[PDB]
Write an enzyme that holds these catalytic residues in place. Structure first.
Site, PDB file in Angstrom:
ATOM      1  N   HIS A  41       6.300   2.128  -3.554  1.00  9.81           N
ATOM      2  CA  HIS A  41       6.822   2.813  -1.663  1.00  9.81           C
ATOM      3  C   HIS A  41       4.973   2.388  -1.243  1.00  9.81           C
ATOM      4  O   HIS A  41       5.390   2.109   0.020  1.00  9.81           O
ATOM      5  CB  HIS A  41       6.426   4.055  -1.656  1.00  9.81           C
ATOM      6  CG  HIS A  41       5.993   5.006  -2.413  1.00  9.81           C
ATOM      7  ND1 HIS A  41       5.764   6.116  -3.152  1.00  9.81           N
ATOM      8  CD2 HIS A  41       4.057   5.294  -1.981  1.00  9.81           C
ATOM      9  CE1 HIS A  41       4.182   6.508  -3.437  1.00  9.81           C
ATOM     10  NE2 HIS A  41       3.095   6.209  -2.455  1.00  9.81           N
ATOM     11  N   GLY A 142      -2.534  10.094   0.360  1.00 15.50           N
ATOM     12  CA  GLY A 142      -2.940   9.290  -0.072  1.00 15.50           C
ATOM     13  C   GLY A 142      -3.494   9.294  -1.086  1.00 15.50           C
ATOM     14  O   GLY A 142      -4.084   8.437  -1.719  1.00 15.50           O
ATOM     15  N   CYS A 144      -1.279   9.737  -3.913  1.00 14.66           N
ATOM     16  CA  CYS A 144      -0.259   8.774  -4.899  1.00 14.66           C
ATOM     17  C   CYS A 144      -0.994   7.708  -5.595  1.00 14.66           C
ATOM     18  O   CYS A 144      -1.926   7.405  -4.683  1.00 14.66           O
ATOM     19  CB  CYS A 144       0.981   8.354  -4.243  1.00 14.66           C
ATOM     20  SG  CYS A 144       1.763   9.324  -2.463  1.00 14.66           S
TER      21      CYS A 144
END
Lengths: 301, 301
Positions: A41, A142, A144
């Site tokens: 993503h 943030g 991820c």
């Protein structure tokens, strides 16, 4: 003495953490050898209620990637995708790559989370995979790409790459083969946590640590057979028992059999009364038998 | 979302751990620059009984020190005693010595513990200093010398050197100036533990975190004046609250005032009794306001 949900030391994993940026996205990647691994993503649009990864990949420009380790920028050779992950060939070998493997963690299993932001480690903490394939993490935007792993000597065993947050705030990741844990989707939609049960085999583990630390007041005088506890469990929000005997060491050193603890467990859910059991929800399933035995006696499960 | 008692990443500290042996006896040391710091009971009688440290010291030989940073044995050029520590000068400057500093922690403050064995990191976890200057840690034999620290923007702030465990399972250490926390003695002597009380401040922080995370069953319909709470608290092993300020941002976001939380704390004290608050034991005081703000918004103080 004592029992702490702890992490193993994060040094070897901190060295493999990188900042991956693309378009309007920034998150964290794992740099191993000359490949960088991060959530796909990172190449999505931040504005659509939906991500068309097929589109996103089709039209990808390699020179839109910004990847760094510290202040050193790594050059993108190219990208491949697998499941919910990108695998980014870079032009440099990470010399700090430890020996590692990949594993998919099973419900009831513990591992470390290294919570990362802007490509560097910020915090490290232990978790336990819940029966609904989520973990009770602590993460803000943030995060991820933050990796999960265990260290077996030896080898870093990677099991988790952080992907998303459910509506309840518990979290979900993928393994490093890109398979989303619990079958969730790496989409910006707010997905939902399914029903979970306290993992009974870990509750037992916790009780033994407590006996061993002089926590005794909860200890039932009665006892209850394993499957008759099992029929009560499935309709009381607690898991069934299968590993008979990983408790042999504990049962023997306390002179408290498993059935006795099962009786105590049944008593404890109907609440109290008294308070503390070292801490600790009174009834936590975060501790595995392996963990407990280790903080009790420092030994390979 | 989420709240977890975590540790800062331990990488920078792991490279300062060494094995410190006098003879004979074994524990962990901290290698900063060309100095190794370790507890002074490393020279002390191999456990029968009390330690005349002047005697032990007058009689000491430097070459009776084997000090290994992993593989390499370090060579001892001299030694100085400060409070309950030894500072041992060595041949070589620890290449990986970080910018560091010493600071003594106050009761109710959090820090990291890096649990060491055989002169190297095996585990890391966050703790909070209890009002009787002990911590509820997790150590077994071999753990002495395990450092405690906070990392403040690059700077490692050393605040703890593990010294002993009391009869209760409490853990006691000294600051890096050799000062024993809470007045205890680095003596194999029978020793008693002070009376502790939960930090209400911290409990509040935790409950505010629970609200922000949408855990709201436990929340009282009532208020209690701060004064009235303080009266109750000193009969119930809880600290008084005398400064309201550090909760304004949290009271702002939730719309819920501390007087409402105070009433909730009383109510939860006479227990609850069914299930968790963010995974914990209804209540915990292991979290500060700073810790909570940090994991909620990624921002300091």
């Amino acid at each position: 003495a004592g029992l702490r949900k702890m992490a193993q030391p994060s040094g070897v994993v901190e060295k493999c953490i990188v900042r991956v940026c693309y378009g309007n996205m920034a998150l964290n990647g794992l740099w191993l050898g000359d490949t960088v691994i991060c959530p796909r993503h990172v190449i999505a649009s931040s504005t659509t209620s939906t991500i068309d990864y097929d589109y996103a990949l089709s039209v990808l420009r390699l020179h839109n990637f910004s990847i760094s380790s510290g202040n050193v920028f790594l050059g993108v050779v190219g990208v491949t995708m697998r499941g919910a992950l990108l695998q980014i060939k870079v032009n440099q070998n990470n010399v700090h790559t430890p020996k590692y493997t990949y594993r998919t963690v099973r419900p009831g299993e513990s591992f470390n989370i290294l919570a990362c932001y802007d490509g560097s480690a910020a915090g490290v903490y232990g978790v336990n995979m819940r029966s609904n394939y989520t973990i009770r993490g602590s993460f803000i935007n943030g995060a991820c790409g933050s990796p999960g792993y265990n260290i077996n000597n030896g080898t870093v065993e990677f099991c988790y790459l952080h992907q998303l947050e459910l509506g309840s705030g518990c979290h979900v990741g993928s393994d490093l083969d890109g398979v989303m844990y619990g079958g969730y989707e790496d989409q910006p939609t707010l997905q939902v946590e399914g029903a979970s049960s306290l993992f009974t085999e870990n509750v037992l583990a916790f009780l033994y640590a407590a006996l061993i630390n002089g926590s005794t007041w909860w200890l039932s005088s009665s006892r209850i057979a394993v499957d008759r506890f099992n029929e009560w469990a499935v309709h009381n929000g607690m898991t069934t028992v299968v590993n008979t005997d990983c408790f042999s060491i504990l049962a023997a050193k306390t002179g408290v059999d498993v059935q006795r603890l099962l009786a105590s467990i049944q008593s404890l859910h109907k609440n109290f009364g008294g308070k503390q059991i070292l801490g600790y929800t009174s009834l936590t399933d975060e501790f595995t038998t392996g963990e407990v035995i280790r903080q009790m006696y420092g030994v390979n499960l």
